[PDB]
Every structure is written in structure tokens, then in C-alpha cells.
Amino acid sequence: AIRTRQTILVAAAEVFDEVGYEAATISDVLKRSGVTKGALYFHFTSKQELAQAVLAEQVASLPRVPEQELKLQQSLDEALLLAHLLREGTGDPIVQGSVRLTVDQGSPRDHLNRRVPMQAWTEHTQSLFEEARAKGEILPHADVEALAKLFVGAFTGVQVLSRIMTGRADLAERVADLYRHLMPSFAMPGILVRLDFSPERGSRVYEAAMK
Amino acid sequence: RAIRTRQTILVAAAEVFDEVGYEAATISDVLKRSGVTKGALYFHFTSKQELAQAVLAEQVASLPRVPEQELKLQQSLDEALLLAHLLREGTGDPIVQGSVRLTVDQGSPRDHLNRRVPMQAWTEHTQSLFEEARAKGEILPHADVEALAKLFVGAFTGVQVLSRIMTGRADLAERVADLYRHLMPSFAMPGILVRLDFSPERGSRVYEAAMK
């Protein structure tokens, strides 16, 4: 049961990533997972429940990197880690599939709650910014709620454009560009000098998070 | 008569694609919504694919023109807020909403929708305005204008997505203004940011002029 649920979920995420929710079927998930019909239907009744469980595990399946000196470096590290996990070279399969389900508009008919992962990303980002403000890293009257929405929104679209134009190959640089152009508007100048946008730190954070 | 019929079918297909997406859409749905005969549909379009490609091909031309301005960055801002209005539903443009959904929706690897083409056209259009702004001393003299255009097109797309999910695009004007207000200080020359107008009143004047 324990690894079996995960095996099914990973397979469903890969199927949803390739064809989307509507074109996917339970049969495809069975083939890809390589588990019995019994094991699948023990954990999930339907395609709907599968896709909802993929969405519900989006945030928890991001590896958190150890707490940092600078909260804004933590925010930067997470965004570049997420960019790496979305690159198809080395997939986290849950994240890619979950993101596709979230961004794909779907139908009013389907019962997929796409607010849940976005609300969770927004709230997580807002907390980091609130913690950064208490540690003297942000300008005095920064609208931290509006900033969180901006970052989550902007990241999503940079990731979408990057998928369309390069299959996410340039995503690290697009995300670094985004953060380099947004952070000056609210970060204390003395924090900006200290932030590390390098690919080398991107690697170190990624390698540590995998094991 | 045949020009109106083609357009009526296209508008209907755009609305259907907007509601259920490319994959879930069918020719039958487009027929019901358009209210034309099967003969009239297949005269103009062979398939669902050709319908969706024609929706994408009309994306750019269905953006209303904003007048040339003194401040090129104001022109860029005006366009983005106008696009935000056209994506908010009411009398808001069915071709644009459906085209945007087709562009952003990931689709299948086997479908023959070229989603690069409209994004490349948006990127190139934005890059031109920024190139003109750079020559007029509005933005830094060696600003990476290609990278900036990609950032703006990418960021706008995602702000629009997040806004759809959380509010059905109700807050989109403010989210877009926020984006522009927080991105522009990193590459605008000293005088410039204070001269930009993010007001809803200017948004109106631009929208009303564009409808006529």
C-alpha cells in the first residue's frame, strides 16, 4: 500500500503531463504504473480522484531546502529548484503533471479544485516575505500580499512561455531574470548585493534536495 | 454573406474552445453554437484543427490599436491594460479569450497547433516598443530588450492565469498594473516611472477610443 499509492500517483502525473486531464484514462495510468487493477482501485475510484490527489500533493512534493541566513535567498532558491524540477531532462513527475492540471483551464463541468495549489503557493510565498520583513530584508511599506500574488503569477507565466518556446530548457535563466527584475522594487539594497542568482548555487541546492 | 458566415463560425468556435478547450471540443458543439448548417461549416473549415488554427491566426488582428504616444512605456502599459479588459468577460472579445486559452493550454504532442507563432508575435511586438523606448532615453541605454520582452509576455500570461483561477479575471487590471509597477523601475530612466499613468480613467479613455 505504502509505495503503491505513490507509484500510481507518479504514473498518473506523467500521463496527465503528456495528454492532459480530458484525454487521459484510467487504462493509461494502469499501463504506465505497472500495478494490478486491484491495487489501483484500492486507492482511487476514478480519473477525477487521481487528478485531485495529484493537485493536492503539489506543494508537499517540492523539496524544502534548509533554512537560510536570508529569507529572500530562500525564496530565490525555491524558485530555481522548482525551475529545475520542471525541466524535463530530470523530471519530478508529480510537479510537472500537477502544474499542467493547474494551468490547463479545464471545464466548469469537472470538479478539480485548482485554487488549492495556487492558494498554497501564494500563502507560502507571503509567509517568507513576512519573515523577511521582520528580519529587515524588505523596504518599509512593501505590500507583501500583492507581492506574493505577483511572484506566483509571474513564475507561472514565465514557466508557460518557456515550455512553449523551449520545452523549459531556458527556464532557469528566465526565472533568474524575473527575480533580478522584481527584487529591487522591495528588497533592502544591502540584501540585493548579497543575493546569489548563480547556476552553481542552483546546482548545490538541487543536489542537496535530492538526497 | 460568406464573410459573415465564416466569422460567425469562428466566433462560435472561439467561445467553445474557451469553455472546454481544444481536446474536449467537437464539430457538433461549434455547429450548435454557430447556428449554421453542416454544409456551411465544412465549406469554410475541414476540421476542428483548422478551426482552432483560424482562431489563433486572428489573435493579433483582434487586439485593438492604441494610438502612438510620446512615452513608449505608456503605450506598452496601455496595451497590457486594454488586453486585461478584453480578457475580462462581458462584451469582452470571444476570439481573444479562446485564442489565449488555446495558446496557454498545453495540448497534445501530436496536435498541429503552432503555439509559438502568437507568443513570438507578442514578444516581437513588445520588444519593438522597448527598442523604441531605448532610443528615446526612456529605458537604460544597454537594456537587454529581448530578455525584457520575454519577461513581460511571460509574466503577463501567468498573472492572467492566476487571476482566472482565483477571481475569474475580476482583479486582472490591478494585478497587471502591479506587475508593470514592480518591473519597470529596474530598467526605466530616472524621470520616467513618475510620468507613467496606471489610472482606471486612462484605461477607460483608451478602451472607449478603441471600440469606435
Author numbering:
A (entry chain B): 8 to 218
B (entry chain A): 7 to 218
Sentences from the paper on this structure:
We also present structures of AvaR1, in isolation (2.4 Å resolution), in complex with avenolide (2.0 Å resolution), and bound to a synthetic DNA oligonucleotide (3.09 Å resolution) derived from its natural binding site. The overall structure is reminiscent of that of other TetR-family transcriptional repressors, and consists of an obligate homodimer. Each monomer is entirely helical and consists of a DNA-binding domain (DBD; composed of α helices 1–4), and a ligand-binding domain (LBD; consisting of α helices 5–13). The dimer interface is formed via interactions between the two LBDs and is formed mainly through hydrophobic packing interactions.
The structure of AvaR1 was determined to 2.4 Å resolution using crystallographic phases determined from anomalous diffraction data collected from SeMet-labeled protein crystals. Notably, the structure of AvaR1 undergoes conformational shifting upon ligand binding, and a structure-based superposition against the ligand-free structure illustrates that binding of the hormone results in an ~10o shift in the DBD of each monomer. This shift results in an increase in the distance between the two DBD in the dimer upon binding of the ligand, which would preclude DNA binding by the ligand-bound homodimer.
